[PDB]
């Protein structure tokens, strides 16, 4: 319960300046969040895809 609250502090305060590059969304699952909550966090963001057909 403290881990989950600490994630929220990270997300709302520290994340403005600090990365957490070694943690994937899957790592939160079954630790702080359900599969669905973590999928929702991931799906809100945009990541680089592979180039389209025109490259």
């Amino acid at each position: 319960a403290s881990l989950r609250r600490g994630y929220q502090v990270y997300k709302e305060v520290c994340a403005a300046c600090h990365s957490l590059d070694r943690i994937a969304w899957r790592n939160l699952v079954g630790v702080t969040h359900t599969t669905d909550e973590a999928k929702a966090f991931a799906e809100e963001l945009e990541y680089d895809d592979e180039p389209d057909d025109e490259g």
Binding site: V29, G30, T35
Partner: peptide, 11 residues
């Protein structure tokens, strides 16, 4: 016979 709940499984 053990199932991981769907909520706790990233994969």
């Amino acid at each position: 016979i053990r199932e991981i709940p769907a909520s706790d499984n990233p994969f």
